[PDB]
Structures are given as C-alpha cells and as structure tokens.
Design a binder for this molecule. Structure first.
Ligand code: NAG
Ligand code: AIN
Length: 361
C-alpha cells in the first residue's frame, strides 16, 4: 500500500516551531513524498519560491537515507489560475512546450515524477485534461528509452461530484495515470451557514442535505466511473477547519458567523494545523459524529471539525477493505511534525497511525 505525503513550500515561513523544511521529514514514514508547489512560465515547469532549488535538493537527499523513497513535484495548486493552466493545455504548441519541459527539469532536481495539481478544470477544459495526461505520459514513456527508470505521473483529483463531472474524464485518465489522489476533505462549503465536517467518511443520519458529501460516496463514484482500485489513493486531512459560532447552539446545523480565528502558527482564518489543534483541545468539549466517524471540538465561540488518530486509522481501515492503492495525506507540515504538541512524544502522530494500519492484516 502506497502512503502518499504532500509537503508545502511555504511551510518554511511559519513562525518558530511552525517553520518546517523538508529535512524534518522521517524518510521511512511515507512511500511517495510530493512537493508543492511548482509554477509555470514561458509555458514550462519552473520553481515557485526563491529557493526551491535548495529545498528540492534537501528533499531529494532524504532519498540517500531511504534509497527506496520516491519523490514527485506537483504543478499549480490554487495560488495559480485555472485560466492559466487551461490556457496552456488547450493549445497544441503550448501544451507541447510545457510537456517537453518537464523530464529534464524533473531529472535535474532529483524528482521521480510529476503530480498534476490543476485546481480545477472547467467543462471546456475536460477534453484537454485527457489530452494533457495522455500526451504527458507518452513523453515519460519516450524518455524511459534513455536509461533512467520511467517517470511516475500522477494527478490530484477533487472529490466533489459536480467537480468530477465538470472537468475530469476518469475512465480515460486512469489508464495514463500511475495513481489518482482523491481529495476527500473539502466536503463542507463556505456558503453553508452552519457547522459541519469537511472530511466525513459516511453521510450522517441527521439530515442528508445532498447524499454525496463524504469520502465513501466519492470513492464508489470513482470506481463507478472506472478508476481501478489499484490506482486510487484516498485523501486524508491532517488539518482541521474552524468556524466562529453565531450562537451558543453547538450541534448539528448550528448557525455560523464566519470562519474561526487564525492559528498562532498557520496564521490563516478558517484553518488549523493538528499541532495547533491538540493545543486547542485543552479545555474544549469534544464530540463525535457516530454516523460519519469523525470528531469535532468546541470552546468559546470556536467549533472545529478535525481528524484524530482514531478517525484517521478508521479511514486507513476502510480503504484497505475497499482495496484501494493507498492513502494521501494533506500535509506533513500540518501534522505534529516535531511531535511536541500532542501529548505523546511521537513525531507525525497522524501519519504514523495510518502507516501502522496499512501494515496490519
Ligand atoms: C509564475 O508564473 C507567472 C506567469 O507565468 C509569473 O507572472 C509569476 O511571476 C510566477 N509566480 C510565482 C509565484 O512565481
Ligand atoms: C491547505 C494547507 O496546506 O494549509 C494552509 C491553508 C491556507 C493558508 C496557509 C496554509 C499553511 O500552509 O499554513
């Protein structure tokens, strides 16, 4: 079973103990470590940060410790216009320039493949997303001829039913892709003027407002659309989402005034790291959606839907039974990487719990 772990390039700026570089990463933790993010310019893969070349090197040296670890580089992400990506993929010469540009860049910096983080294609874009993956793969196949082991090509897919339908032809891209990472942690939109869990496993017996907002639906649907199990990786959040309550009402359907306050380290409204969360838990009221098997916390006018070791193992169990390829972790820098915030002296608590589960019978 593959354990695919993402690392973010900006994690480095976070203040104090939030500062995370790639040298903090335990080399036998994951199987595939992906580095976000990579930019495009002059229609070809380029770096984002001012010192990615150093960081790439720091990552791809961890491979000296674990000769078997594989490392990919992801392209795009959100801080990067769909319109931009779309512009490149929709034309035959810009799509070819960019493609032609990857293998050498990737080989220069030690990466073993490319992850396509197109934070999402429109419906006019679906056709080119297929053409882009198809042609991209063909290039990795033609450079394999030159000695070095073939470059892995993976894609990052959203788990929202409308989104999949809009810009992804699953049956077609699953052939050309080495694995698909399904983003099962964005199941609770902004508009929702209430609390709710973003990465629930099951529906929720309370009042199905759209039988589709959970990992289980999303998984069935991909396997239904034709993505083989041996190619699916379920996405597991290592972070939580906070919201500021609009009343003292704290359970299902509770009203919401807007996102929760910024964390001390992550400094972003509406989101918290697991290390920031273990700290928040102190003097909080914890609960659990029996139905959806995921926890949430609450203190003051702050309510959080998050993922703990039990929930994360429970997901890691589910996907084994489903016989999927493995799990994907949205982010390493957001797990308790120093292992100094969550009680037990264990670094990467959350990602370790899974790893353990992937090796059980
Ligand atoms: C990446 O590409 C865009 C357009 O190619 C360029 O204008 C911009 O400076 C780059 N963005 C970053 C964050 O490097
Ligand atoms: C999604 C993720 O990686 O966490 C964040 C989300 C929004 C803004 C900042 C961060 C962060 O990395 O600190």
């Amino acid at each position: 079973y593959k354990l695919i772990c993402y690392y973010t390039s900006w994690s480095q700026y976070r203040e104090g103990d939030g500062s995370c570089f790639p040298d903090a990463i335990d080399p036998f933790l994951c199987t595939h470590v992906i580095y976000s993010f990579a930019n495009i310019s002059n229609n070809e893969i380029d770096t984002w940060e001012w010192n990615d070349v150093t960081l790439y090197d720091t990552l791809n040296t961890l491979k000296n410790r674990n000769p078997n670890l594989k490392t990919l580089l992801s392209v795009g992400g959100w801080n990067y216009g769909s319109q931009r990506f779309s512009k490149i993929a929709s034309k035959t010469q810009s799509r070819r320039t960019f493609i032609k540009s990857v293998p050498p860049f990737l080989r220069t910096h030690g990466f073993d493949g490319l992850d396509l983080a197109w934070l999402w294609p429109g419906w006019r874009d679906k056709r080119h997303l297929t053409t882009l993956v198809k042609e991209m793969k063909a290039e990795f196949v033609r450079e394999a001829q030159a000695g070095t082991e073939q470059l892995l090509l993976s894609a990052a897919v959203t788990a929202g039913k409308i989104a999949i339908d809009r810009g992804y032809d699953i049956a077609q891209i699953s052939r050309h892709l080495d694995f698909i990472s399904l983003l099962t942690y964005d199941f609770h939109g902004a508009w929702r003027q209430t609390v709710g869990h973003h990465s629930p496993l099951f529906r929720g017996n309370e009042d199905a407002s759209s039988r589709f907002s959970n990992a289980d639906y999303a998984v069935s649907y991909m396997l239904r659309l034709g993505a083989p199990a041996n190619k699916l990786v379920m996405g597991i959040p290592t972070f939580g989402r906070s919201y500021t309550l609009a009343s003292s009402k704290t359970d299902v359907g509770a009203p919401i005034s807007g996102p929760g306050i910024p964390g001390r380290f992550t400094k972003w409204k509406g989101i918290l790291a697991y290390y920031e969360i273990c700290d928040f838990l102190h003097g909080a009221t914890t609960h659990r959606f029996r139905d959806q098997q995921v926890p949430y916390a609450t203190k003051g006018n702050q309510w959080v839907a998050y993922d703990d070791q039990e929930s994360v193992k429970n997901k890691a169990r589910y996907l084994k039974n489903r016989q999927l390829a493995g799990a994907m972790v949205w982010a390493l820098d957001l797990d308790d990487f120093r292992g100094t915030f969550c009680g037990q002296n264990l670094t990467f608590p959350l990602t370790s719990a899974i790893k353990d589960v992937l090796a059980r019978v």
